[model samples]
Target chain A: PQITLWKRPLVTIKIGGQLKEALLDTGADDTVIEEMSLPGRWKPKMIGGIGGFIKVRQYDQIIIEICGHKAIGTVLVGPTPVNIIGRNLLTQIGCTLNF
Target chain B: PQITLWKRPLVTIKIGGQLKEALLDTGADDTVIEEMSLPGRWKPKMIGGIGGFIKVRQYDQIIIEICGHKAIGTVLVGPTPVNIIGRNLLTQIGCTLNF
Candidate 1:
């Protein structure tokens, strides 16, 4: 799938049977979301961003669909002001910066 | 050039003859810098983000070199928490999301 980065590349993703809008952040390392209510057991981890470090719930074995492309990977929850689809999922969908 | 987004896609860029590291944020609309002392006249504008809105100085006709690729576009500066290479610059560099 091809995406236009002319603006904030916000895409619709389906996770845990729920649909959500997530920003495609190639700069981010992990797929971070706002909540952790999805069914799963997670380990606590700290992540550093532009502002600072924040605690997050790192859940393994998450299945997400981005623009109809399905991918399974780790998902982080908490302290994320917005839902972000990082390289983890982007790579699964073959994202790149080639002009 | 092909780049990886495993972590924060921080790369060295030269702007106005100054070298600095910036994050490749496909989620951002405008390329935002911390300082606005570049040799160009700018117009004041406000942009909203994850937290809130921020005032920025938008400059035109800025030439930036990112990863050995020369791109000319608009560059914004001001209360940006971090230097972000947004989609405006990414589009010029032919950035895309595909897998």
Candidate 2:
């Protein structure tokens, strides 16, 4: 037998400089940030891709310390009209929709 | 006494080439589209901005038809990493985020 994972509606995240709000979306597979709104201290990193694989310098990892819990993952920096808290980060926090 | 409008959680919208789902955000003031995801038939438009109304072409309107409900509003077209269905159009659909 296999167990299935549930989805949640909301998750709290501290982004930029404060404890800002964000929506938890299972539909999104990647973590993204507003390119023009990114803080100056963030440095870019190059990571290997599929198959031990082609090198890609597309994303960065931010250590988001939240609610006495800490998680780290790749965040795609781009100009998103709105800030979103997607599944990539939510899974690290042990989030599950109980409905 | 002023009556406050209640906000809602989810809103169903048709975007790109499918009937997509979007979180309704009363906090947002404008609709936005991913510049890289816009359909080919869309055309850019010019509108006036704040303070003495200087001409600008920063936004465009896309008529979204949802569940037999039709609404029209200006969409801010840019390289947004994601699509946002905001208050400008939600108000027309009578969305209220019920807790």
Candidate 3:
């Protein structure tokens, strides 16, 4: 799929057995999702972006299906404006930027 | 150019007649740059992201060259951790997400 930048590059994703929308963020280094419940243990962590920093719960070895592609990576649960599938998970799904 | 997600999709952007590095961010709706001086009229504005909101100076009709593609649009100057080229400008450069 080739997604133009005319609109937000959002895609459907399946995480924790639920379907949700996430942004495929090339600028973000780590995948982050809005605060949610996911099974397993998560460690306290802090991540920063354009705005500043936010403390998050880091859940490792999580399975997520992005646009129907399966990927296992680390997911940060935080108070993000939206769910962002960053490079960490994007790479697993073979996502890329082109012009 | 095809950019893989294995690394940060940083590119050289020419703004205010100066060259700098910026991240191509699909998740962000607006383009933001670290506090800088540009010759033009601007208005005070506020923008929010993951952590919180910040005050910015909105410079309209700014000429920015991203990866050699010229685009004239609005650029928000603020205290961003790094310069981000969001969808607003990305669309002008014909940037797209592909899998």
Candidate with best lDDT: 3
Candidate 1: which stretches are off by over 4 Å?
B34-36, B42-57, B78-82
TM-score of each: 0.80, 0.35, 0.96
Q: Model 3, stretches more than 4 Å misplaced?
A: none
User: Which model scores highest in TM-score?
Assistant: 3
Best by DockQ: 3
- Measured against the true two-chain complex, the DockQ scores of the candidates, in the order shown, are 0.48, 0.02, 0.86
**What digit string (tens of lDDT, one per residue) describes model 1 on residues B40-96?**
788998876444467888999899998787899899888666788988888887877
Error of 3 at A80 (Å): 1.3
Residue B43 displacement in candidate 3 (angstroms): 1.4
Given candidate 1, what's the lDDT at residue B77?
84
List of clashing residue pairs for candidate 1: A93-B99, A94-B98, A94-B99, A95-B98, A99-B94
**What DockQ would candidate 1 receive versus the native complex?**
0.48
Q: Name the candidate, 1 or 3, with the larger DockQ value.
A: 3
In model 3, residue pairs whose N, Cα or C atoms come closer than 3 Å (at least 3 residues apart or on different chains), thus clashing, are none
Displacement of the residue A63 alpha carbon in candidate 3, Å: 1.1
lDDT to native, each model:
0.80, 0.45, 0.90
Q: How big is the positional error of residue B87 in model 2, measured in Å on the Cα after superposition?
A: 16
